[PDB]
Design a binder for this molecule. Structure first.
Ligand code: HEC
Ligand code: HEC
Ligand code: HEM
Ligand code: HEM
Ligand code: HEM
Ligand code: HEM
Ligand SMILES: Cc1nc(CO)c(-c2ccc(Oc3cccc(OC(F)(F)F)c3)cc2)c(O)c1Cl
Ligand SMILES: Cc1nc(CO)c(-c2ccc(Oc3cccc(OC(F)(F)F)c3)cc2)c(O)c1Cl
Lengths: 57, 146, 239, 370, 74, 370, 74, 54
């Protein structure tokens, strides 16, 4: 079986599980997406932000 | 049926993310603003007077015979110098322990709870000695109440 | 008679994800103090707003301890002066507008809190205002106190030239030329009328990488349901 | 054409055996509109800031052309509101209307909406009881563990009541009566599937009648006595119920000797005041109200009313006393003669509901063989 | 819900008159006031005695409160 | 059980041939809730007094934890509101929905409610255009004879805008969206007796379908693009529409050179500005709106839509230009090049409606023999 | 109003399929884009020309405005 | 700022600029205002009359 079908019969079949899945993924997703944009935002504005001038003072 | 419903989940994933943040945005508005916090911890204060000054929208009430009182006799066993850091600088939150009023120095008026010069109870509907805040002395002419 | 449109200058923050060079905010604040704060009543700011942006707690708190502030009813029933603290807003120059008009040629300095967003073009205007003082043209005559600058409407302003090359000196020691001053100050003023610029872009960015990611999936979930009826053949089979 | 919904209010079937009690059920429709109507014009001049608020009240009471009235048609009007409730709520107990389970529960959420509204309505003008009355009631939620200090600080916008906490109410307060205005329509909708509930308790379907000529004018007559018994207060005794202190400006560094919120909490405030413990008295308070949701699971008699249950009559009006006691006992300070009464009366409140009113029907079923 | 399908009635007769053909307040004093009393006697016993006792606990509650503030012989 | 009313919103019959235009008809349900939701938390800190108001705005934009957002989700949100309207209103013209005579008239009273609401919503913060924008619009009613000076003084609480006139709006303004929230339910009720009105104009009763799976998600999709095209403004360009002057404090002794209210009046403001006379231009303004009530007495074609009327299409989108002109021409000052356009364009507005759109169907009936 | 008494249908047949048994976006590029054009050609003529003229009156309106501020030879 | 003769629209000339100076110009105690003292004190007139005359 593909990952998809293995994914279906484990999680996406029983609705009680299907809601348990989403908060789990969301709970971890919050931990990645913030780190991503905060770094990209840091990266694009390299040499401008407070944390980049946080050591001098 | 897996691929299609997978879309439905991953949608609902992002819905919660946008929802978890935006809701807490408002709820932080109901929280204390930035202006109030700057007046929260700081109180730069400077013998024989009932010094009561407003702080956090609450009062700030500021030894020869005080130590004579027996701690075991007190409703709440607690010594004076446990409460204070300097002996001759009493500090406490002026909250009558019973139901939240303003005691008067040289005393809970709404229930007549007798207090020491230090603020400890002697006669009380007041169960405890009055609340003492955490504080700090930068120098002997200034205080950091907080 | 005419207006004047400033150009579209570049900046360290004109981009749709370009934040402010906080260093450039730093030296700009020195300019407001040595120069502007004798006549510009910026009231809607305090030193505590400078923390986490250009200075630290102690370094900024040093500046409130510097200047004295009117505060407190004494138990004697009077008011006194104390060294400022963080919670106090900027020391206002003058108690009211009128004394500012009397201490000038009848004219009033506008505040700089929200001047940038309150003036068409904002920075480009303000930069090109200071850096547009020039000798008058032919045929023009102007009263005392006034001066010439095209960008200001009417081309007649009661603005004494406030900036000149090495009017002061900064801390790190950059070239204190009339331009580099004008950048760091105009960079500062945008922050005054926008303490949210740094965070505006963060949620400015987090939005797309959700919506750009969601909006197709929804656009599938739409098309997932409608596909029953996007694909439907009918008929008509009477006797 | 939507007028046909007012079959509900024009051609409705309703009984004929109906008292003037049920006028009280209708006056709130007038009080709710009358209060908003007044309060709206009232709030054209109020200010949601400390330094000007108390002045912004007196800006009305003095300078406005007939603005002085509107404070008192509103304020005492808010009290004639409750006087209808605590006859309207005690009704269904005495006539067995709580059986409409879908409706009685709505009759709670209206109340709690108000008892958190009217509270907000007392604190706006900073009457030196506003502040402490805001402090005493609001501080109780600090009794909770691990969240009490956080919520109360969160609703105090900081660490105690201040300019922000005013303005957080004036918007929470100028809004909810509309939420009551809506939920009230729900409170009638579940009714319209069954209609009213006679004093007897019997389905009077055989004797239902119209509503446009008969109960309309009766309601007007009911309304006319209301305005009368509201004009008397404002015209002849506005200082009666509202404590006098509420004209003093507010100062956190000076409490009055005696504190009480407005008179109508007092049946409930006293209950907390009886318990010397902090938390364990609170959950009696919230239970002193939500118990009304617990009643319909305690309807014992296979009858409905109390017109036909003389024993329960002896216990019902008894409860009215204990309330009229707890209404007053809380209104007086904390001293030994009264505390002995609160420890009893507050227990009597829970006791009459949860033991004896069931016990009557448990008996009265047996006196008559079912 | 409305008139027409509520419930059943059989063999009942109703006699009702205009208002115009009759006084509004007939025997208001004559028959009413005896009916007020009969109305009253059937409620008074199981309505007052709590409120009667209240008058006593509003009585003793203040008297016993007044004494406690007056000094003792000591 | 009252859930069964949501047969209206769950099991409703509606067509299948439906565009994404009608999402706009639904977003206002979101914008109306979204605006109140924001504005409520917003107004926990606003102050209805002059000296503190503009500060009380900046109290939010600076010090509050994420309070700065809520000003702009609200403000620019109030503009995405209209952008749905002036696609939603132009719709029924182009698809012939105004024939639902009981409904279109409701579609007016919502609008006038807003165009007297949003006005009140611009003046609260005293942006130096607030004041004069309040003065210019409000002064026009003085044009009336024998009552103009009396009403405007009456609404000016005196003789000109001042502290009182602020507070008379903040209560008139924090209330009406609920009146819109209610009347909106009426606006749907008269619909539910007939259902929607397809682009063709034909009774599609044969092809009506549910609503819970299909148009729900479509509305969400419609809503998702809204939030997107609302986050862009607040996040990336909040200064775009709102004139910059609104950050300046207000002073009656200094006007700006150029004055314009917010951009959305301008189709209507320009109409007044064209007429050099005072009064005779006003009644064009009010008629520039109430003309929408006059349309259903001018439906000539025995068809309904404009999908099947290519001539009227040429005249419909033409009207959109004249609006997009008058939207801009009012936004620019009073000088000779533009005044010549307003005298034309404003006349074109009345002209296209009252002469030529009927004239098309008068013809198109005849091209096809009825 | 609801399903059940709307109107009459006689002798019509409907063929409809699950979504799961079919791709969501079939021929999205192939058949759509020609359908975008045909959709476009049938509207463009009676949609633009007003907006085209607007571009000219936004054009001439500014140019003729700019000149009027420039001085005259006098 | 300057001083002028009062007019009708001006409220009563306040004695002291703030409460504290009133406490310092007395034995630490503060005169309460008399605007709403009558309705803010149990009994009002009878109190106030019998205060002075007691
Ligand atoms: C001599 C005191 C003084 C100094 C020093 C000063 N200002 Fe000014 N400022 C004024 C006065 C007076 C005006 C009045 C201008 C007017 O009325 O048009 C003004 C006007 C302005 C304006 C308003 C622009 C406008 O459109 O009217 C800005 C921006 C400004 N100054 C910025 C600055 C900056 C930047 C500096 C330092 C480089 C500075 N000011 C230093 C007094 C001063
Ligand atoms: C010497 C200055 C002064 C004079 C003159 C004066 N008052 Fe007082 N008033 C005070 C002070 C000080 C208090 C503080 C009383 C207290 O703290 O209990 C006070 C208290 C009061 C009170 C408050 C009553 C209460 O319950 O505390 C009233 C009422 C009052 N005065 C009325 C009057 C009247 C009437 C007169 C003229 C007959 C008058 N005052 C004249 C200074 C004055
Ligand atoms: C059931 C609904 C409400 C209750 C129980 C309530 C309660 C109260 C009370 C008890 C007061 C007393 C203040 C006094 O007497 O001095 C008051 C005042 C006030 N009410 Fe409310 N209120 C209600 C709804 C409203 C409404 C609907 C409005 C506006 C439409 C409003 C606006 C105000 C304002 C501004 C004040 C300050 C005036 C004052 O303090 O006298 N309230 N309210
Ligand atoms: C603003 C608040 C309220 C409004 C506008 C309102 C309105 C009404 C009206 C008009 C009636 C019909 C008249 C009548 O049956 O006597 C009614 C009945 C009723 N109400 Fe209230 N009510 C309110 C609050 C409450 C509260 C607080 C309760 C608390 C339990 C309650 C419980 C009931 C019940 C049980 C009925 C049953 C009717 C019957 O027995 O025939 N209502 N309400
Ligand atoms: C259709 C309904 C409404 C419209 C069209 C409207 C209009 C506006 C507008 C255009 C602003 C812009 C002010 C700015 O950008 O600085 C504003 C601000 C404001 N809105 Fe309203 N509003 C509406 C409803 C509301 C509601 C429902 C509330 C509260 C629940 C509210 C409270 C406020 C307050 C206090 C302000 C002052 C903040 C400010 O000026 O930025 N408004 N309103
Ligand atoms: C807050 C304001 C409004 C709300 C909440 C609202 C809501 C709605 C909704 C949900 C629909 C059904 C969707 C649709 O039929 O496309 C609708 C339809 C309609 N609305 Fe709005 N609307 C508002 C303002 C207006 C205005 C200003 C007009 C001006 C004429 C208007 C006229 C109509 C008409 C004629 C329909 C006919 C529906 C059809 O042709 O099928 N509405 N409205
Ligand atoms: C038996 C009985 N039934 C009903 C309705 O079924 C009513 C009754 C009649 C009319 C009603 O309409 C009103 C009138 C004014 C305010 C009101 O509040 C509002 F509008 F919901 F806020 C409702 C509300 C209730 C009634 O007075 C009696 Cl006695
Ligand atoms: C054809 C059609 N019909 C209807 C209702 O018949 C709707 C429709 C469906 C649900 C609606 O419910 C809402 C949802 C949010 C706010 C709202 O406003 C308010 F404020 F609640 F009155 C109404 C409102 C309208 C619709 O979206 C379409 Cl496309």
């Amino acid at each position: 079986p593909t990952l998809t079908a293995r994914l279906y019969s484990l999680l996406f079949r029983r609705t009680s599980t299907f809601a348990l899945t989403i908060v789990v993924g969301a709970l971890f997703f919050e931990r990645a997406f913030d780190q991503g944009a905060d770094a990209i935002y840091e990266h694009i504005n390299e040499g401008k932000l407070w944390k980049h001038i946080k050591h001098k003072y | 049926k897996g691929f299609s419903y997978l879309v439905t989940a991953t949608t609902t994933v992002g819905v919660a993310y946008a929802a978890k943040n935006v809701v807490s945005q408002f709820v932080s508005s109901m929280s204390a603003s930035a202006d109030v916090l700057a007046m929260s911890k700081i109180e730069i204060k400077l013998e024989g007077k009932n010094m009561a000054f407003k702080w956090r929208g609450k009062p700030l009430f500021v030894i020869d015979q005080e130590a004579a009182v027996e701690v075991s006799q007190l409703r709440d066993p607690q010594h004076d110098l446990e409460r204070v850091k300097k002996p001759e600088w009493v500090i406490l939150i002026g909250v009558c322990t019973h139901l939240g009023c303003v005691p008067i120095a040289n005393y809970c008026p709404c229930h007549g709870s007798h207090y020491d010069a230090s603020g400890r109870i002697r006669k009380g509907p007041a169960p405890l000695n009055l609340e003492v805040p955490s504080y700090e002395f930068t120098s002997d002419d200034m205080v950091i109440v907080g | 008679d005419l207006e004047l449109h400033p150009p579209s200058y570049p900046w360290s923050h004109r981009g749709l994800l370009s934040s402010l060079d906080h260093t450039s905010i730093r030296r700009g604040f020195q300019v407001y103090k040595q120069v502007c704060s004798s006549c510009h009543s910026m009231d809607y700011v305090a030193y505590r707003h400078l923390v986490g942006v250009c200075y630290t707690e102690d370094e900024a708190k040093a500046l409130a301890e510097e200047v004295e502030v009117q505060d407190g009813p004494n138990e004697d029933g009077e008011m006194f002066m104390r060294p400022g603290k963080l919670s106090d807003y900027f020391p206002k120059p003058y108690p009211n507008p009128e004394a500012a008009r009397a201490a000038n040629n009848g004219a009033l300095p506008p505040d700089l809190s929200y001047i940038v967003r309150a003036r068409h073009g904002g920075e480009d205007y303000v930069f090109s205002l200071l850096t547009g003082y020039c000798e008058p043209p032919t045929g023009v005559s102007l009263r005392e106190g006034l001066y010439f600058n095209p960008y200001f409407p009417g081309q007649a302003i009661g603005m004494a030239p406030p900036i000149y090359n090495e009017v002061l000196e900064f801390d790190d020691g950059t070239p204190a030329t009339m331009s580099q001053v004008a950048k760091d100050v105009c960079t500062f003023l945008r922050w005054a009328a926008e303490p949210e610029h740094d965070h505006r872009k963060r949620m400015g960015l987090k939005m797309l990488l959700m919506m750009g990611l969601l909006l197709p999936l929804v656009y599938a979930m739409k098309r997932h349901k409608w596909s029953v009826l996007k694909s439907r053949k009918l008929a008509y089979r009477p006797p | 054409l939507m007028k046909i919904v007012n079959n509900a209010f024009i051609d409705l079937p309703a009984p004929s055996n109906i008292s003037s009690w049920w006028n009280f059920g209708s006056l709130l429709g007038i009080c709710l509109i009358l209060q908003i109507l007044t309060g709206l014009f009232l709030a054209m001049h109020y200010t949601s800031d400390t330094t000007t608020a108390f002045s912004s009240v007196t800006h009305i009471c003095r300078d406005v052309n007939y603005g002085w009235i509107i404070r008192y048609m509103h304020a005492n009007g808010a009290s004639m509101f409750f006087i209808c409730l605590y006859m309207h709520v005690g009704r269904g107990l005495y006539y067995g209307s709580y059986t409409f389970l879908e409706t009685w529960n709505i009759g709670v959420i209206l109340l709690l909406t108000v008892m958190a509204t009217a509270f907000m309505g007392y604190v706006l003008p900073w009457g030196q009881m506003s502040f402490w009355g805001a402090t005493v009631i609001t501080n109780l939620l600090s009794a909770i563990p691990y969240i009490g200090t956080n919520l109360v600080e969160w609703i105090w916008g900081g660490f105690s009541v201040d300019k922000a906490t005013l303005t957080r109410f004036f918007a929470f307060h100028f809004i909810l009566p509309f939420i009551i205005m809506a939920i009230a329509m729900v409170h009638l909708l579940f009714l319209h599937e069954t209609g009213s509930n006679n004093p007897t308790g019997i389905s009077s379907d055989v004797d239902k009648i119209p509503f446009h000529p008969y109960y309309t004018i009766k309601d007007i007559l009911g309304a006319l006595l209301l305005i009368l018994a509201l004009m008397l207060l404002v015209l002849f005794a506005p200082d009666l119920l509202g404590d006098p202190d509420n004209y003093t400006p507010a100062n956190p560094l000076n409490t009055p000797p005696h504190i009480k919120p407005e008179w109508y909490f007092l049946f409930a405030y006293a209950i907390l005041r009886s318990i010397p413990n902090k938390l364990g008295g609170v959950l009696a308070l919230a239970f002193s109200i939500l118990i009304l949701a617990l009643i319909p699971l305690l309807h014992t008699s296979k009858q409905r009313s109390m017109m036909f249950r003389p024993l329960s009559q002896c216990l019902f009006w008894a409860l009215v006393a204990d309330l009229l006691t707890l209404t007053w006992i809380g209104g007086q300070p904390v001293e030994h003669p009264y505390i002995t009464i609160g420890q009893l009366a507050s227990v009597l409140y829970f006791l009459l509901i949860l033991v004896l009113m069931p016990t009557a029907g448990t008996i009265e079923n047996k006196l008559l063989k079912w | 819900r409305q008139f027409g399908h509520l419930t059943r009635v059989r063999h009942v007769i109703t006699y009702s008159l205009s208002p115009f053909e009759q006084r509004a307040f007939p025997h208001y004093f004559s028959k009413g006031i005896p009916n007020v009393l009969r109305r009253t006697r059937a409620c008074i016993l199981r309505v007052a005695p709590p409120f009667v006792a209240f008058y006593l606990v509003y009585t003793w509650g203040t008297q016993e409160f007044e004494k406690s503030k007056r000094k003792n012989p000591a």
